[PDB]
Design a protein around this ligand. Sequence first.
Ligand SMILES: Cc1ncc(COP(=O)(O)O)c(/C=N/[C@@H](CO)C(=O)O)c1O
Ligand SMILES: Cc1ncc(COP(=O)(O)O)c(/C=N/[C@@H](CO)C(=O)O)c1O
Ligand SMILES: O=P(O)(O)OCCNS(=O)(=O)c1ccc(OC(F)(F)F)cc1
Ligand SMILES: O=P(O)(O)OCCNS(=O)(=O)c1ccc(OC(F)(F)F)cc1
Ligand SMILES: [Cl-]
Ligand SMILES: [Cl-]
Ligand SMILES: [Cs+]
Ligand SMILES: [Cs+]
Ligand SMILES: [Cs+]
Ligand SMILES: [Cs+]
Ligand code: NA
Ligand code: NA
Lengths: 268, 268, 396, 396
Amino acid sequence: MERYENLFAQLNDRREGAFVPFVTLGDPGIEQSLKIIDTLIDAGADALELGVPFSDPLADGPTIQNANLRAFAAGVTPAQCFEMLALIREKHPTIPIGLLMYANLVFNNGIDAFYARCEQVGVDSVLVADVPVEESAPFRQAALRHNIAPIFICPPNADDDLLRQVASYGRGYTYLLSRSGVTGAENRGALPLHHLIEKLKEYHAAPALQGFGISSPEQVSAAVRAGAAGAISGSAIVKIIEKNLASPKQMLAELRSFVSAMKAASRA
Amino acid sequence: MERYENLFAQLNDRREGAFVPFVTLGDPGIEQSLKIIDTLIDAGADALELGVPFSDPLADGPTIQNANLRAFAAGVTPAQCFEMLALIREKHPTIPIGLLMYANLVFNNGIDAFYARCEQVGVDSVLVADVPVEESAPFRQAALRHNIAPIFICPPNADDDLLRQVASYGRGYTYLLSRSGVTGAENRGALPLHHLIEKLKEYHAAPALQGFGISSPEQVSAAVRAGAAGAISGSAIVKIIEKNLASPKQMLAELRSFVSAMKAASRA
Amino acid sequence: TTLLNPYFGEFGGMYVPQILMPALNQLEEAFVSAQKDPEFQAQFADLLKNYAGRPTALTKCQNITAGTRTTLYLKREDLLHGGAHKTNQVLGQALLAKRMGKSEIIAETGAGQHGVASALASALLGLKCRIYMGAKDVERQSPNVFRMRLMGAEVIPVHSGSATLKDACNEALRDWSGSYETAHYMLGTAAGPHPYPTIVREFQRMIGEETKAQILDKEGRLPDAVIACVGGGSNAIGMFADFINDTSVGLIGVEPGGHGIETGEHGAPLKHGRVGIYFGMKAPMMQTADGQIEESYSISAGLDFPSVGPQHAYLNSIGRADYVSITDDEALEAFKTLCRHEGIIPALESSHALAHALKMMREQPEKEQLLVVNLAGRGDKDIFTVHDILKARGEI
Amino acid sequence: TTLLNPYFGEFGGMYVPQILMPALNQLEEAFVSAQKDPEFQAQFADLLKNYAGRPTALTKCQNITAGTRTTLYLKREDLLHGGAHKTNQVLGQALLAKRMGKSEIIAETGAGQHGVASALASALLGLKCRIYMGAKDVERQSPNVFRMRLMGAEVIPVHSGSATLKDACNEALRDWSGSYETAHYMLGTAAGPHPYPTIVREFQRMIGEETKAQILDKEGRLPDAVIACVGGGSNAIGMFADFINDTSVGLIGVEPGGHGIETGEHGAPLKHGRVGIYFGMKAPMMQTADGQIEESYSISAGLDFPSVGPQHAYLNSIGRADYVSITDDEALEAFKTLCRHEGIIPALESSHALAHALKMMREQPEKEQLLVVNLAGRGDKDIFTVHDILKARGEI
Ligand SMILES: Cc1ncc(COP(=O)(O)O)c(/C=N/[C@@H](CO)C(=O)O)c1O
Ligand SMILES: Cc1ncc(COP(=O)(O)O)c(/C=N/[C@@H](CO)C(=O)O)c1O
Ligand SMILES: O=P(O)(O)OCCNS(=O)(=O)c1ccc(OC(F)(F)F)cc1
Ligand SMILES: O=P(O)(O)OCCNS(=O)(=O)c1ccc(OC(F)(F)F)cc1
Ligand SMILES: [Cl-]
Ligand SMILES: [Cl-]
Ligand SMILES: [Cs+]
Ligand SMILES: [Cs+]
Ligand SMILES: [Cs+]
Ligand SMILES: [Cs+]
Ligand code: NA
Ligand code: NA
C-alpha cells in the first residue's frame, strides 16, 4: 500500500505536520490498549508507532521499560499483538501503522515470515531499534518484498554516507533522532537538525519525523518549522498511561487532551 | 632441710615405697583445698606434689587442665598459693612438699626471688615442667641456694648422658616418667622402667618416684617391685575432686579411701 | 564500514542502535592501532606482570590422576590479582579507554567478578567507574558489591526485566548510548557487538600463550586437549586462541548443564539453545519460544550469561572446538575433589571444566592423555554455597 | 646439646618438657641436613614456583604517594596460593616432615590462615593433618574452618584456658608430646622453641630475597626501609632476613596497637609487654602482673599471637631493627586507602604495615625515601569486619 505517501501528500495540502504517538501494544492490558489507541486516533493522531513487548528493550528509557513490563504482567505475547494489529487495521483504513521492534522478535520465527505477517495484518512500516544500517540488508529486503516500509534512523551524529544510505534504502518516513541516549520525555534534544533535514530532502529521502524527547506543543511546531514532516511522541504519552492506571476514564481524557494539543501544534 | 632424705631413709627401714598425691592448690577453692590436702596426709600420703594454677599448663591432660580452671574460677593467685603453702608447712613439720611449676611463674618476679619465697614458706622441691635439663642451670642454681631440691625428669626416651646429668644435678627425688604424652589417668604407661631405675642407682641419683598414669594399687606395687622409691598419682586424685564438687563430704571420704588403698600398696 | 570482519562465519555482527555505531567504529580503530603500538603493549605488559602478577603458574595435579594414564595440569588464573582471569582484559580495555581520551568506565556484571575487576583497574588507572548489576544479583552478591564500593566504583542495581545479568547488559548499553563521548563500555566477556569478541580474545590470549610455553617446557609437547568453562566465553577463548592453528590440540568448552539439559534448567545455549539476535550479536541464546530472552541457570553464579561468544559458535560449527555440558552435581563433586586431593579451592565456574576433565580420565583410565584445565578463578567465594548444599544433603 | 645456638642473644631457647627434647633435636638435624641437600631444595623450589606461584610481584604504588617524595612498593604475598605468606614455609616444613619419615601434621591456628596453609600443604603432599584452634576462634572464623575441612584436615576446637590461640598452641604441644614419633608439629610463626624461629625464617626468606632482586632491577638501589606487620614474626623476618647485613636498609616491624597502647588493649608485647617464658621460648609476652599469659588484642584477627619471635626481640635490642605500633583506626584507614587508590584489598594485618608507611610519608612528605611494605595477605576475608565497622560509624 502507499499509506505514508498518501498521508504526507494530504498533510502537504493541509500545510500540516504529522503528529505520531507511540504506545506499547497491550499496555496496560489488551482491551485497555485497544481503547487507548482508538482514543489517540480520534483525538488527531496522523499515524501510529506501536511497540511489541520485548524482554530487553535496550533503546528505551524507564518510562517505556515500564510499559513493556506492564504488558508482560498482563500476559501479552507477540502473537496477541498481531491479533491486535489486525483489529486496529480492520477499524481504520488509511492511518499508517509502524511497529517498533527489536531484532530478536523479527528473527525469531524467520525474518521473511515476520514481514509476511506484518503484510497480512496491514502494518505499514517496521523500525528495528537494534539493527543499524550496516546490518539492515535482510530486514529491509524482507520489508520491501512484503510491501512494508523499512524505517531508518538518521542520528544527529550522521555523516554524508549515512544520509545517502538512509535516503536510498528507506521508505515511508526517515526517523530523525533528536539526540543521543534512549527514549524519554525527561531529556529534550538540544541539537538543531535543520541541516540534516535539508540534506535528506536533497537526497530524496522519505519525509522526516523527529523523535525522542518530544513532550510539548512547542517541540512539534519547532520540528515543522525546521522542515521536518512531523514529530513522534512516546514517553509523554506512556507517562499518562502510567499516571492513570487506577482511572481508565481519566487516562483516556488526558490522552485525548494531550494528543489534541500536540496535533494542533502541527499547523504550520 | 633434709625432708626427702629423711623420708626415704625412714621408708627404707619400713620396707615401704612412698605414695605421693598431686593436687592443684586452690582447687576447688582455698578452704576446700586445705581440707583436701589435710585429708591426703591423714590418709597416708608420704609427700605432696602441689600445682600452682597456671594459664597454660602444657604438660597437663584435661583432668588437670580443669583443676587449674576451677582454681582460677575461685580467684586463686600465686600469692594466695604461697600463703596456703606456709600454712600447710605450719601444720605438718616433716612431710616433703614439692611444687609443680611452669617456667613463667618462676621467672615472673625473678627466679632467685621465687626460690627464696619457697624457702621462706618451707617448700622442699620444685619441678618446672617446661624447663628441660638443657635449660635448667639458673633454676637449679637458685633452688640449691635456697635449700630447695631441683626435680629432674628422667623420660623413658633417656640416653646415658641424660641419666648422668639428672643423677648429678638433681636432689630430693628423680621423677621417673611412665610414658610420653601429658598427665592423665586415662593413659597407662606400657614401658618397663627397671633398667632406668638401675642406672639411676648406679649413678647415685636421688631416689626415683614413678609418675604419669598411676591410678591403681597394682601400679604402686609394680613401681616398688621394679626398684623405684615410690609413685606419684595426680589425675586419679583430681578426678575424685571433679566427681564430687557437689558433695565436699563424699569428696573427702573418697579421697581418704583412695589414698589409704594406694599407700597400703606401697608395702614391699 | 569496519577495518575487520564483524562476523565469525554467520555469528556475531554489530546489532546496536545506529547511535552507537561511531563508538564501535572508534573502539575498533583504537584497538587496531594499539595492537601495533609498542608503547601500548609495554604498558599492558607492565600492568599484567607487576600489578596482576603474570605469568601464572601451571600446576601439575598428580594426586587426582593417580592410577590412570591422564596427566592433568591446571592453568592458575586463580592466582591472578582479583582471583579470576577477568583482570587480564580489564587492564587492556582500561588502557584503550585512556588511548581514546575516555575518563569514565561503564561495566556490567552478573556474579560480580567482572565488576570487581573493572573497579580495581579503574581505581589503579584513575578512571571513574560505574557498574550495572541486576538487583537480584546485587542482593545475592553483597560481598562483591562491597568490594566494588571499597574500590570507589558506583554500583547501580538494575530493577528492569528479570533484574539479572541480561538486564544489566541492557542498562550498560543504554548509558553508553548517551555517554560514549566521555565513557568507555568495558564489556566483561568475549561477546556483544564487534569489536568486543575480538578485543576480549586478544586481551586474554596470554593464558594460552603461557600455557603453550609452560607445557612445552615441562612435557616437551603440546597438550592433547585444553578445557575451559564457557559462560560468555572469555576465559575459554583466552586459553584456546594460541592453539587454534595447532590442530592436534583439542579445544573443549564446558557450558553449565544446571539441573540437567532435559530439565530446561541449564545455561548451555551453544549446544541446547537457539540462535537469536541480542546484546549486539547473532549467537545461540537462551530464549522462549516466542523470542523473549531467558536466563541461564547454574549452581555457579558466573556462568549466567544467557548467550555465548560468537567465535565459540563459529569454532563449534566448523568442528575446530567441541562443546559439552556438566551438571551442578558433577561440578560440585569436582570442587570437593580438588579441595581434598590438591589443596586448591576452585571457583564453581571452573569446577565445570575440571569435572569434564575428570570424566575424560575416569571414563577411559588407560587412555594416555595430557590435559590442561583453565582454572579461571579461585573458589573461596563459593564456600558458603557449598556449605549450604552439603548441609541440606546431610553431608555435614 | 644442639648443632646451632638456640638463642638470639638472651631471647629464645628450648623451654619444652624434657620428653620433647629428642623431637626438637631431630628436627634441627633434619633441617641442617635439608639445607645442604640439593634434592630437598629443588623439591621446595618446585612447589614454591609451580604450586604456590612464586615469585610474587613487586607492585609500585604511584597513586597513594602522589605529591610526596616517597616511592612505595608492595611485595605481593597476597597473590600467593592461599592468599597469604603462610604458604611458603608450610611447604618447606611439610617436606621436612617427609624427610624425617613423619606421616601426620599437627598445626595451631588463630585467625585460620596458618590452618588453611597447613591443610593445603598436607592435602597436596599426602599427610594426615590435624589443626587445633581455640573454640572462640573456631566460632569467629567459620569460613576458614570450613576451608580447612574441605581440604580434609581435622579441626579440633580447644575449650581450655581462654579458648584462643595460646590455648591452641598448648594443645598442639600436648599432642606432639605423645605423638612425635609419627607426627610433625608444623608451627605457624617464627617463634616457639628452637629450632622453629630459625626454620621459619629460612623457609620465608625468599620474600626478602626476591624483594632485593626486584628493587635493584627497578630502582637500581636497595630500599631505605622495609616494613612488615609483626604478629608472631614470620612474614617480617622473611622480608628482613636478606637485608640484615645491608645495614643501610631500615627494618621496621609493626605490632598492633589495638585501642591504643595506653588502654592496655593491644598486641604489642615486643615494645609494651614484659619478657616471660612460654611456648618454648624466652621472649616479650602479654601477661598479667603475676605471670599468667594474656591475649593480644587487635582489629586484625591474625595479629593475635601473644608473644613475638625471639629474633625480633634480639634485632630490636641491638638496634638493627625498629618496632612500632599502629592502632585499629590507623589500620582501617590504610585499608580503605589502598582499596580506593590502588585497587588492592589488603589483609587488615598487613594494613598495619601500610599504615606505618603512610605515616612515614605523610609526616615528612618532602623526604625522599624508597619504602617496601610486605603485603603479607589479601583482605577479602576482612570485608565483613570492615563493613560492620563502617556501618556502626554511619559511614555507610
Ligand atoms: C569466576 C568466573 N569464572 C568464569 C566466568 C565465566 O566468564 P567467561 O565465560 O570466562 O567470560 C565468570 C563470569 N562472571 C561474570 C558473569 O557473571 C561476571 O562476573 O560479571 C566468573 O566470574
Ligand atoms: C593474614 C595474616 N597476616 C599476618 C599474620 C601475622 O603472622 P606473622 O607475624 O607473619 O607470623 C597472620 C597470622 N595468622 C596466624 C595467627 O592468627 C594464623 O593464621 O594462625 C595472618 O593470618
Ligand atoms: O518520545 P520518546 O522519547 O519516548 O521517543 C519515542 C520512542 N518511540 S519510537 O517507537 O519512535 C522509537 C524509535 C527508535 C528507537 O530506538 C532507536 F533509535 F535506536 F531505533 C526506540 C523507540
Ligand atoms: O597421675 P598423672 O598422670 O596426673 O601424673 C601426675 C602429674 N603431676 S606432677 O606434678 O607429678 C607432674 C610432673 C611432671 C609434669 O610434666 C613434666 F613431666 F613435663 F615435667 C607435669 C606434672
Ligand atoms: Cl554475514
Ligand atoms: Cl643464654
Ligand atoms: Cs527513498
Ligand atoms: Cs644426686
Ligand atoms: Cs597419572
Ligand atoms: Cs611519589
Ligand atoms: Na554459555
Ligand atoms: Na606481636
